[PDB]
Amino acid sequence: MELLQGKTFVVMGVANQRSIAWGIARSLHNAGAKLIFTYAGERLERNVRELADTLEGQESLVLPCDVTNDEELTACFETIKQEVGTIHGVAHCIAFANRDDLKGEFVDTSRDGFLLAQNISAFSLTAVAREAKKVMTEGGNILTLTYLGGERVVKNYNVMGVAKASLEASVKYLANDLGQHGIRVNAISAGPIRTLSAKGVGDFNSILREIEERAPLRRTTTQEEVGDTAVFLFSDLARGVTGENIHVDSGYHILG
Amino acid sequence: MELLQGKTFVVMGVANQRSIAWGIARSLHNAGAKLIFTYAGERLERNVRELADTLEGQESLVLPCDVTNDEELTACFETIKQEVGTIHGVAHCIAFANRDDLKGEFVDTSRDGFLLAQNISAFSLTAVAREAKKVMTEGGNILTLTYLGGERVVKNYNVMGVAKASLEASVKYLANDLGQHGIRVNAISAGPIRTLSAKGVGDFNSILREIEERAPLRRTTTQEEVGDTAVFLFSDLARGVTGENIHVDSGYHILG
Amino acid sequence: MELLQGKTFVVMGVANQRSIAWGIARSLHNAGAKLIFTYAGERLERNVRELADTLEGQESLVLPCDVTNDEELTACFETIKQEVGTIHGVAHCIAFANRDDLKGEFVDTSRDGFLLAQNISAFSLTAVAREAKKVMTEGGNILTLTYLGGERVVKNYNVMGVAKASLEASVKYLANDLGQHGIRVNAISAGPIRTLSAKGVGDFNSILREIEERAPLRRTTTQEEVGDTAVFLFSDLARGVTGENIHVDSGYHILG
Amino acid sequence: MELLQGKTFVVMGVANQRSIAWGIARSLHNAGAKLIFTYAGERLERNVRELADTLEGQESLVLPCDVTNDEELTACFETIKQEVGTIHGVAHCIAFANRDDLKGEFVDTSRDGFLLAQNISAFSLTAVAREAKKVMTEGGNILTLTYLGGERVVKNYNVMGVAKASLEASVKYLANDLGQHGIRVNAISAGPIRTLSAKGVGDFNSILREIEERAPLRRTTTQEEVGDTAVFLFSDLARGVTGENIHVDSGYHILG
Ligand SMILES: NC(=O)c1ccc[n+]([C@@H]2O[C@H](COP(=O)([O-])OP(=O)(O)OC[C@H]3O[C@@H](n4cnc5c(N)ncnc54)[C@H](O)[C@@H]3O)[C@@H](O)[C@H]2O)c1
Ligand SMILES: NC(=O)c1ccc[n+]([C@@H]2O[C@H](COP(=O)([O-])OP(=O)(O)OC[C@H]3O[C@@H](n4cnc5c(N)ncnc54)[C@H](O)[C@@H]3O)[C@@H](O)[C@H]2O)c1
Ligand SMILES: NC(=O)c1ccc[n+]([C@@H]2O[C@H](COP(=O)([O-])OP(=O)(O)OC[C@H]3O[C@@H](n4cnc5c(N)ncnc54)[C@H](O)[C@@H]3O)[C@@H](O)[C@H]2O)c1
Ligand SMILES: NC(=O)c1ccc[n+]([C@@H]2O[C@H](COP(=O)([O-])OP(=O)(O)OC[C@H]3O[C@@H](n4cnc5c(N)ncnc54)[C@H](O)[C@@H]3O)[C@@H](O)[C@H]2O)c1
Ligand SMILES: Oc1cc(Cl)ccc1Oc1ccc(Cl)cc1Cl
Ligand SMILES: Oc1cc(Cl)ccc1Oc1ccc(Cl)cc1Cl
Ligand SMILES: Oc1cc(Cl)ccc1Oc1ccc(Cl)cc1Cl
Ligand SMILES: Oc1cc(Cl)ccc1Oc1ccc(Cl)cc1Cl
Numbered sequence A, B, C, D: 001m002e003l004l005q006g007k008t009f010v011v012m013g014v015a016n017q018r019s020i021a022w023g024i025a026r027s028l029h030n031a032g033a034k035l036i037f038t039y040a041g042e043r044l045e046r047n048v049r050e051l052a053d054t055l056e057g058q059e060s061l062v063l064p065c066d067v068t069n070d071e072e073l074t075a076c077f078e079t080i081k082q083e084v085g086t087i088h089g090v091a092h093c094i095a096f097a098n099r100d101d102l103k104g105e106f107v108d109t110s111r112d113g114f115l116l117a118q119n120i121s122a123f124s125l126t127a128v129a130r131e132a133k134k135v136m137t138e139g140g141n142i143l144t145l146t147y148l149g150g151e152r153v154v155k156n157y158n159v160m161g162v163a164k165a166s167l168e169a170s171v172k173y174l175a176n177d178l179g180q181h182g183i184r185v186n187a188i189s190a191g192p193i194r195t196l197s198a199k200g201v202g203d204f205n206s207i208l209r210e211i212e213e214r215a216p217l218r219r220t221t222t223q224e225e226v227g228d229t230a231v232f233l234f235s236d237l238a239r240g241v242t243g244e245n246i247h248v249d250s251g252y253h254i255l256g
Helices: A020-030 A042-053 A070-084 A099-103 A111-132 A158-181 A196-200 A204-214 A223-234 B020-030 B042-053 B070-084 B099-103 B111-132 B159-181 B196-200 B204-214 B223-234 C020-030 C042-053 C070-084 C099-103 C111-135 C158-181 C196-200 C204-214 C223-234 D020-030 D042-056 D070-083 D099-103 D111-135 D158-181 D196-200 D204-214 D223-234
Strands: A008-012 A034-039 A062-064 A089-092 A140-146 A183-190 A245-248 B008-012 B034-039 B061-064 B089-092 B140-146 B183-190 B245-248 C008-012 C034-039 C061-064 C089-092 C140-146 C183-190 C245-248 D008-012 D034-039 D062-064 D089-092 D140-146 D183-190 D245-248
Touching: A008 A020, A020 A034, A020 A042, A020 A089, A020 A223, A034 A042, A034 A070, A042 A062, A062 A070, A070 A111, A089 A111, A089 A223, A099 A111, A099 A158, A111 A140, A111 A158, A111 B111, A111 B159, A140 A158, A140 A223, A158 A183, A158 B159, A183 A223, A223 A245, B008 B020, B008 B070, B020 B034, B020 B042, B020 B089, B020 B223, B034 B042, B034 B070, B042 B061, B061 B070, B070 B111, B089 B111, B089 B223, B099 B111, B099 B159, B111 B140, B111 B159, B140 B159, B140 B223, B159 B183, B183 B223, B223 B245, C008 C020, C020 C034, C020 C042, C020 C089, C020 C223, C034 C042, C034 C070, C042 C061, C061 C070, C070 C111, C089 C111, C089 C223, C099 C111, C099 C158, C111 C140, C111 C158, C111 C183, C111 D111, C140 C158, C140 C223, C158 C183, C158 D111, C158 D158, C183 C223, C223 C245, D008 D020, D020 D034, D020 D042, D020 D089, D020 D223, D034 D042, D042 D062, D062 D070, D070 D111, D089 D111, D089 D223, D099 D111, D099 D158, D111 D140, D111 D158, D111 D183, D140 D158, D140 D223, D158 D183, D183 D223, D223 D245
Parallel strands: A008 A034, A008 A089, A034 A062, A089 A140, A140 A183, A183 A245, B008 B034, B008 B089, B034 B061, B089 B140, B140 B183, B183 B245, C008 C034, C008 C089, C034 C061, C089 C140, C140 C183, C183 C245, D008 D034, D008 D089, D034 D062, D089 D140, D140 D183, D183 D245
Antiparallel strands: none
16 A cells, blocks of 8 residues: 555546546555546546546646547647656556447458557557656556457457457567666456446446356456556566566456 | 369469469469469559469469558459359468558557558458458358567567557457358468568568577478468368468477 | 378377277378378277278288387387388377366366376377387478367366376477477367267267357367368478467367 | 565475575565465475574474375375464475486486476476365465466476476466365466576576566566565455466567
């Protein structure tokens, strides 16, 4: 509860209280971290500011950052650098795909939808790392969130599965790049969690019940389980760990 | 010598006599197949045509097909359908990334370069499969070519490594989609081979020397070794094999 | 039907007409190979000789070979050397574990049952390779059979899953050893097939139904599909392929 | 710091203060854990008793446990049960192979050397878990240590690589078994560290220099980096993590 004392992290991707990013924010806060939040656009600004305010302590900086927009991304981290001076990591909790691509067969994925999913769900990690690198003057960790669907075929995940494969490969190439600067890059592969974006995946309740039935720990995962693993990865306990993908999924990933 | 007797395959991605696609074409021809060739633009028409000419026992069908162009892709396979009625598979031997992206550090990859590499090197397999599906009425195999860099970090591969991870995930999701229609989808992961596109990968002679020194078979791969593995995957011998990635790389992939 | 003309292979592990080894033998024969058969003990001798006699041509050499017995393993391959002088490959189709260890929880596996499974199902590949190397003076391929349960957790497989992990790792270390001598080592990972040994695995009809319902090709594998992939791996077509594990499982391995 | 307050762990495999198990013991101690130690035989008893003394005083429970000896192993955990009643985890840091089997080509591995390596380095995890299960009534975590050589071919590791493949598969099958009882099972894959047993692996200085040059973090790993990841896996922070293999190896595992 003082593992992250004296450290500041940027948390990207809070949309509401069910967001995995908000679970991460709570765990980081509870471990003593100061937090900077970024939100996608005006629609979500008050949700994020209100949640940030429920944390006790100094008021958290809350900034707009649409990761499809290089100008805004650059400006966002320039502001951060000037206002706080040093950060020790970034939690990248961002993905998007068109729902029409998610519903159809994968072979019917639109070109524009494929590239949009790649842009937001995979390339944005690299765009973010490029700007974050400048502010992580003492090193630290960059974290992203992935899903089993990026490693193997899971139903109704389709275009997002292929985007997560890009993301997981990006984690490795970024780790190899940034390690010499003392920056680690890792992923958490979370099991299914009911979030705002989970509605894009078909019959989510069958999926949850399947986890309960078959996963080794016989229960579904929580935002807090993901956040507590994020606490480890952002801490000095994980200083030897980079380019890794830790499954926080009740062991489901081992099943064949 | 007769494994592919009576079957016709579309080979995409011949550019010159060193192209892996040309090794695949020659092997398929040696196993009794008839071949159709597509070429990327006007600058390649004559060369692809000259090579296609040297296949005895058949006349040439050689068509323009820019896989970024949906109207042309659709028209190309409609022409194929009208000319031969049924094909039994497609060899997708196509990739591209900007030189400046391949030379820099991965973290400095441009957004447009990333999406361009994804479009041409990964999404195009899906775009091709969607059209090929219409002409593969007796089932068959769709093959693509990948590289170890899509699985693990290899030097000077960067944005292409991430595009190959995307391509390999696509192979799996497409296999899952098309299998019910009797269409298999597989990759060959080739070891380094001196081709036109190898010029964009830096220090290639030393990469080859590394294979020679360290690979289990103590030698570099050839276009013909890849071609002969394609013969298998396109044949009835591989009718139980789909969603697979066969390394044709002198064993190098097993090394830690 | 001439891929393997002029070549001689030792097929180990035929027990009856449903044995995967017998699928492999029929495919290799149809491809022009001469064959040598080994059998586990006196109880199987009749079956194996009867099956071998159904092959057109000169009656195949048939020899006892308990792979737990180093004296007999050595004598067997010395007899092979005196009878045919040179062989071009070996199909290792051998496994065993106590049926109590397959039933109970894996954590209740007995020490002697664990070591017995390792001895027969994993180490025997290496013991066989060491003798085969003496007779494979022109190079060739050594093949073994594995199962998805060596990679991920499959129900009831337990101690055999751990032995297959050991087997798959042995394939890689042997490939690295023997490649410099022109010897390739590969595995086929077969999907579930009703054989004599499949009686040891619980609810087998249920397993086959799941494959039929969920596998990309919507059907279960056959001994012939495995045999035809073995033809590839034993042929010159696969001369660039070593340390590989080819799944012949209707694509099931890709599912998450 | 208080992550493990009020919890007791069994540390197996301390030989001297360079032992990875000793790095683990120190980290657990610093996180507030109470520790029980086991030693292999009388040759190492003094080392282990004295090191245990520095952390726990002369109170400490220090017990003989040759993991090849089922009587002694059972007696060990029976003593733990009636001395402390409940434990919350076990660190299994035990491996052995004959030095001859580590130098010769893998194909020359002796049968009894192979089974010996499997017995001590892989089956012991299962035999330990079967006893630990009885005293882990509040749940917890079982940890083992593995090496990249269990996944891919690393030079001069041979029979131990195959034993680590078995160990890693055992982690998965054990996790699937014990999860329903609230017990997690995980591995740490450590990078090369100069320990007592590292002498078994040839030209170790060369291996270390390789890591320093090429690993993403450009430095070799330490016992403390491993211990601190162990603290995470034994803590409530990792309650969603089971059947996982975390590489603590400066990122080296991502490289191809
Ligand atoms: N929910 C699950 O079961 C699950 C499982 C595994 C991984 N994940 C991953 O976790 C991450 C967070 O998703 P979630 O489930 O918490 O849902 P969510 O809807 O709460 O979070 C998605 C976030 O992405 C943001 N985003 C989308 N487009 C953006 C853009 N252009 N610029 C900036 N931000 C943008 C949204 O504003 C939102 O905050 C995603 O990467 C998701 O794929 C989720
Ligand atoms: N050369 C190697 O060492 C190696 C190793 C592994 C994989 N590969 C892969 O093999 C495949 C073939 O590459 P190669 O080495 O034979 O090189 P190459 O340059 O001969 O072939 C690449 C082909 O892609 C085509 N292409 C590019 N953009 C296209 C577009 N818009 N539409 C249609 N075609 C387009 C080019 O015209 C060319 O024919 C690629 O996927 C490559 O990544 C190559
Ligand atoms: N049947 C399947 O669905 C399936 C799937 C994947 C892999 N496999 C593997 O295929 C291989 C062949 O099994 P199968 O299904 O054909 O069954 P099977 O019972 O027909 O063959 C197993 C063979 O192993 C032999 N064997 C056992 N102990 C031996 C010893 N001490 N010395 C020599 N030979 C010995 C038996 O005599 C028999 O010939 C095994 O490795 C098995 O694990 C089977
Ligand atoms: N040193 C490294 O670079 C490295 C890297 C990755 C993994 N590992 C693994 O870490 C673990 C600890 O090894 P280490 O490097 O600390 O060396 P070490 O020599 O300090 O520890 C190995 C321990 O195994 C014990 N052991 C051997 N046979 C035993 C038996 N019959 N019963 C009980 N205990 C027995 C020894 O007594 C010793 O305490 C091993 O599993 C090793 O394979 C080591
Ligand atoms: O990756 C996810 C995986 C699961 Cl099981 C549930 C939700 C996920 O998150 C998303 C899914 C689809 C879209 Cl459009 C956007 C996001 Cl954030
Ligand atoms: O994938 C490849 C791998 C290697 Cl080792 C060599 C060449 C390869 O092929 C390409 C590399 C870069 C670009 Cl721009 C396009 C292609 Cl086709
Ligand atoms: O590996 C196998 C996998 C499957 Cl699905 C079915 C049978 C298999 O083969 C065996 C299973 C158990 C034992 Cl005792 C011995 C063998 Cl040969
Ligand atoms: O697994 C290891 C990996 C490395 Cl790089 C170094 C030492 C290791 O540990 C061992 C190696 C050989 C033997 Cl005989 C026993 C053990 Cl404990």
